[PDB]
Enzyme design. Structure first.
Site, PDB file in Angstrom:
ATOM      1  N   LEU A 128      -8.846   4.116   2.912  1.00 30.19           N
ATOM      2  CA  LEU A 128      -9.805   4.817   2.091  1.00 30.19           C
ATOM      3  C   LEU A 128     -10.600   5.852   2.870  1.00 30.19           C
ATOM      4  O   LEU A 128     -11.188   5.586   3.898  1.00 30.19           O
ATOM      5  CB  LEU A 128     -10.735   3.828   1.397  1.00 30.19           C
ATOM      6  CG  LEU A 128     -11.926   4.490   0.738  1.00 30.19           C
ATOM      7  CD1 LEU A 128     -11.479   5.301  -0.472  1.00 30.19           C
ATOM      8  CD2 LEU A 128     -12.822   3.382   0.278  1.00 30.19           C
ATOM      9  N   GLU A 166       0.784  -1.220   0.000  1.00 31.48           N
ATOM     10  CA  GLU A 166       0.000   0.000   0.000  1.00 31.48           C
ATOM     11  C   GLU A 166       0.813   1.264   0.000  1.00 31.48           C
ATOM     12  O   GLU A 166       0.325   2.326  -0.342  1.00 31.48           O
ATOM     13  CB  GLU A 166      -1.028   0.020   1.183  1.00 31.48           C
ATOM     14  CG  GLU A 166      -2.004  -1.180   1.166  1.00 31.48           C
ATOM     15  CD  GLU A 166      -3.122  -1.128   0.136  1.00 31.48           C
ATOM     16  OE1 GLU A 166      -3.253   0.047  -0.404  1.00 31.48           O
ATOM     17  OE2 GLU A 166      -3.871  -2.065  -0.111  1.00 31.48           O
ATOM     18  N   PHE A 204      -8.514  -6.341   3.205  1.00 32.18           N
ATOM     19  CA  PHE A 204      -8.079  -4.994   3.401  1.00 32.18           C
ATOM     20  C   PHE A 204      -8.335  -4.142   2.149  1.00 32.18           C
ATOM     21  O   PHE A 204      -8.919  -3.083   2.182  1.00 32.18           O
ATOM     22  CB  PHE A 204      -6.562  -5.040   3.716  1.00 32.18           C
ATOM     23  CG  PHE A 204      -6.010  -3.715   4.175  1.00 32.18           C
ATOM     24  CD1 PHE A 204      -6.068  -3.332   5.515  1.00 32.18           C
ATOM     25  CD2 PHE A 204      -5.442  -2.824   3.267  1.00 32.18           C
ATOM     26  CE1 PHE A 204      -5.548  -2.113   5.950  1.00 32.18           C
ATOM     27  CE2 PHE A 204      -4.931  -1.590   3.682  1.00 32.18           C
ATOM     28  CZ  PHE A 204      -4.963  -1.238   5.029  1.00 32.18           C
ATOM     29  N   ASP A 217      -6.528   7.028  -4.982  1.00 33.03           N
ATOM     30  CA  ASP A 217      -6.038   5.704  -5.120  1.00 33.03           C
ATOM     31  C   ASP A 217      -6.027   5.276  -6.574  1.00 33.03           C
ATOM     32  O   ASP A 217      -6.168   6.149  -7.437  1.00 33.03           O
ATOM     33  CB  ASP A 217      -6.521   4.696  -4.067  1.00 33.03           C
ATOM     34  CG  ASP A 217      -7.846   4.113  -4.349  1.00 33.03           C
ATOM     35  OD1 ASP A 217      -8.440   4.761  -5.296  1.00 33.03           O
ATOM     36  OD2 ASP A 217      -8.317   3.173  -3.724  1.00 33.03           O
ATOM     37  N   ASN A 225      -7.567 -19.318 -11.394  1.00 30.01           N
ATOM     38  CA  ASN A 225      -8.883 -18.795 -11.157  1.00 30.01           C
ATOM     39  C   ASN A 225      -8.823 -17.358 -10.700  1.00 30.01           C
ATOM     40  O   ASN A 225      -9.503 -16.521 -11.232  1.00 30.01           O
ATOM     41  CB  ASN A 225      -9.617 -19.652 -10.080  1.00 30.01           C
ATOM     42  CG  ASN A 225     -11.071 -19.209  -9.922  1.00 30.01           C
ATOM     43  OD1 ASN A 225     -11.446 -18.445  -9.050  1.00 30.01           O
ATOM     44  ND2 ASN A 225     -11.872 -19.543 -10.882  1.00 30.01           N
ATOM     45  N   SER A 231     -13.160 -19.430  -6.032  1.00 28.28           N
ATOM     46  CA  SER A 231     -11.839 -19.539  -5.465  1.00 28.28           C
ATOM     47  C   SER A 231     -11.914 -20.066  -4.036  1.00 28.28           C
ATOM     48  O   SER A 231     -10.967 -20.655  -3.550  1.00 28.28           O
ATOM     49  CB  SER A 231     -11.214 -18.171  -5.356  1.00 28.28           C
ATOM     50  OG  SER A 231     -11.071 -17.633  -6.619  1.00 28.28           O
TER      51      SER A 231
END
Ligand SMILES: [Cl-]
Ligand SMILES: [Cl-]
EC number: 3.2.1.17
Length: 162
Positions: free
Chosen positions: A32, A11, A104, A20, A132, A117
């Protein structure tokens, strides 16, 4: 290597409000602020979050605090989610960190929706899973990151982060 170090890598760290990869107001370590197009709405969320008049700027200690709070919410979110919880419980430590990472970034909802998945994760079908997961907006939009996370899932090691 641990979840904290892992997400800090993915990040980055920034002390000023910024956009972002999707164009959203963000600050610190992937925190965020708002999906809204307004910088004032962003500045407002930030003051509410920090508890002070920031002027769109925070210190290092303040980013880390938000980060702590965010890692914690991700974990608690997972453990409260009916689809996620069992997944999490069936995994080894490195791999639990890959799940937190995703949560996250995309939220519980986003992750919970990777239904196919999830089933593979549970069946521990590593390689298939990796294929996948790659068939996704997530991967197409943020490839290098997604590649790190996918290797993590595939190999169960921290190699992608070394
Ligand atoms: Cl907050
Ligand atoms: Cl990327």
């Amino acid at each position: 290597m641990n979840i904290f170090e892992m997400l800090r890598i993915d990040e980055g760290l920034r002390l000023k409000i910024y956009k972002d990869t999707e164009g959203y107001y963000t600050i610190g370590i992937g925190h965020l602020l708002t999906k809204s197009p307004s910088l004032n709405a962003a500045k407002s969320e930030l003051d509410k979050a920090i508890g002070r008049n920031t002027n769109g700027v925070i210190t290092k200690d303040e980013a880390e605090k938000l980060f702590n709070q965010d890692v914690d919410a991700a974990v608690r979110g997972i453990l409260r989610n009916a689809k996620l919880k069992p997944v999490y419980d069936s995994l080894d430590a490195v791999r639990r960190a890959a799940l937190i990472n995703m949560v996250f970034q995309m939220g519980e909802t986003g992750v919970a929706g990777f239904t196919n998945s999830l089933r593979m994760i549970q069946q521990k079908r590593w390689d298939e899973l990796a294929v996948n997961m790659a068939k996704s907006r997530w991967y197409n939009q943020t490839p290098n990151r997604a590649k790190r996370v996918i290797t993590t899932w595939r190999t169960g090691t921290w190699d992608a982060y070394k």
